[model samples]
Target: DGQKKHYQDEFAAIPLVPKAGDRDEPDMMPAATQALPTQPPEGAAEEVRAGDAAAPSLDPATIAANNTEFEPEPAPVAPPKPKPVEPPKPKVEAPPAPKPEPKPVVEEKAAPTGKAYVVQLGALKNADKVNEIVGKLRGAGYRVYTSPSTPVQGKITRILVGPDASKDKLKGSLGELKQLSGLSGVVMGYTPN
Candidate 1:
């Protein structure tokens, strides 16, 4: 805590040869002790010494990074690049199966074979409805036939009532068909081929 003390001639040069008739004063003299100077040299300039100190202890990782030991520098390495992925190949698919050719659609009336007129009861797409009306006509004594259907119009099932009668009698038979069932009907010439 205080300045250290030292002998005055501790570092002084020793006399190599003693002078003739000289007294050995050092041997008889007590050691002259002196205290070391705590401050700078006498008549010296007052120098400013700025020093920074850390209150906290240093971390081990930080000391390792700043180590004074000699070590070979690491090679100049680079990060790896990512590989590009190709898109999935387009799926090869066969063309859809060829569709069957369609038949020509007929809209006009079926030509008559003889001097007879068949009263077309009506055209219906429902099979159950056509069967119900055909049953009613067959129950009575009438030659009932379903005429040709058309696919373009959803296959209208035409119910025709017939007898090979004269034109005047066939005209009268039209009124008879009107009374047979409730239907939107018309007179069309029909004969089974």
Candidate 2:
């Protein structure tokens, strides 16, 4: 009873009047009403329907017109046909016949007569020995040629060294060749047979 009296006296010192209603509640109601007035659902619905109808109709018409214009432009321009026709005819016809014919003929005729000097570097009956000599000569920067063994030629492969136009050059290098391969080559006139 004593503790209850103390608490009652402590609480009794505080005013018994109710707290004033929050001013925020009235402010909130007006804000809510203003928001409702601003949002016209009927107007929003009408605008959305109008925008959808305008977009589809306008977009398809514009796209179709653009596509039609683009399709016809490429057809009339048809520049690809003439370009392919002209290039293929010239490239195919001109290159194959004239280019190959003159090159081989000129090379064959010129090479034999123009390169008059050759060196005969002994003949061998063994194919492996011939290949070894040829590889050695080539490694030493000499253009080496081999004649296939024929019955008339005693069945020996003749390793010939260069038909260079310069006889003196071949004669000079013959010493180096002998040093490299131990075979003293004889300088001779080139016979194309």
Candidate 3:
């Protein structure tokens, strides 16, 4: 806006430096020092200090301390009427309800029932020679089981089983897992749920 009207006409044409008291210049009471009273060129008050300095005595304890004479100030002693029995009002009861210790309902863990277990993995095409025939059917006393299959209606088999047995212990662990004829073992039929 035109540089704010050129800073408001340059601060309204500058004019401020007269510090204090209604902008000064009126104190002139300094003309009263013209005295020449003691002209002792004669009887200097006949030599001053006369009669206790000329009769100026009456002090009687400064006239009894400027006595306006009024002394009746002891009428305020009634503070003993409050001890007549009043200290039994403490009966506030609502703080004994904190016994809510009730937290024992944790119950969740039951989902995986896709009824598992269907093992078949033949055509042993060397998975390290079927892991070296599953390390020699897990080396004997057979707790040895083998799984992993797919091609359902198109072939996939490895059935030598045990863990919770039936069907005659998977046909006697598939006849001792066919005595491991170098990567070749069997067992079948397990339609359970």
Candidate 4:
């Protein structure tokens, strides 16, 4: 019984090998059908070559690019308009003409007076104190004078130094008067009463 079953198993395996070989032949026929679809892709490559022949239509696009470059050149010409605005600079120089008017007025007033300058020490009520201050200033080589008495009773007298022709020269002596007599005074134009 064992020998009969082993021979039946070998016969069944031999029949399965022929069935596998028959399936392989049908698989080769589908590969030949796939090769026919590849022939249509070559036709698409030829259509792409026809599209390259129509590429010369872009010449109008290059002309539009050149027109854009010319538009920016006119924009640069507007910068030169600021040069005409410089004409207002001479108007600034004309305002200084009124400045000389004040200078001549000062010169006219100074010419009319030709006034001498003096340093006034102070006003005092006591005659003894006035004589004492005059003596002290005269001892220091400073020319001193007193204001004339007014008719108004009990009016104060002013003590002064100098009949200097130039006001600047009397101003220089003010510092010496302050240091010598410890008196502070003002410089003023002198008028004889």
Rank candidates by lDDT, best first.
4, 2, 1, 3
lDDT by residue (1-193, candidate 4, tens digit) is 1212221223334655533322222125755634343322223233543335655464555645545444353455355455553444534323233534323323323223365666778778777777777788876777877775541226677777765554444554455445544555677777554
On lDDT, the stronger of 1 and 3 is 1
Evaluated with TM-score, which candidate comes out highest?
4
Number of backbone clashes in candidate 4: 0
Candidate 3 residue runs with Cα over 4 Å from true position: 1-123, 131-133, 143-159, 162-187, 190-193
Runs in model 1 with CA error above 4 Å?
1-112, 149-154, 163-165
RMSD of each: 47.2, 34.0, 44.4, 43.0
* lDDT at 188, model 4: 75
- Give the CA lDDT, 0 to 100, for residue 115 in model 4: 56
- Cα lDDT tens digits for candidate 2, 1-193: 1212221123233454423222212225646644334322323333443335555554557655656345453456455664432343333322233433323323343244554666778687777777777888877777877763341233688777775555445544554555544555776666555
List, residue by residue over 1-193, the lDDT tens digit for candidate 3. Answer: 1212221123232455222212111223522343223223222223551233544365435433334233223653355765533432562222335654345323221112222222243444435544544456556554445454521333432434343324333343343334422234333444434
lDDT of 1 by residue, 100-172 (tens): 4344323222223454567787677777777777888866666777865431235678887764444444554
Candidate 4 is scored at a TM of 0.35
Name the runs in model 2 displaced over 4 angstroms: 1-115, 148-154, 172-182
Residues forming the 10-long window of minimal summed lDDT in candidate 4: 1-10
**What's each prediction's TM-score?**
0.34, 0.33, 0.16, 0.35
Clashes of each: 0, 0, 4, 0
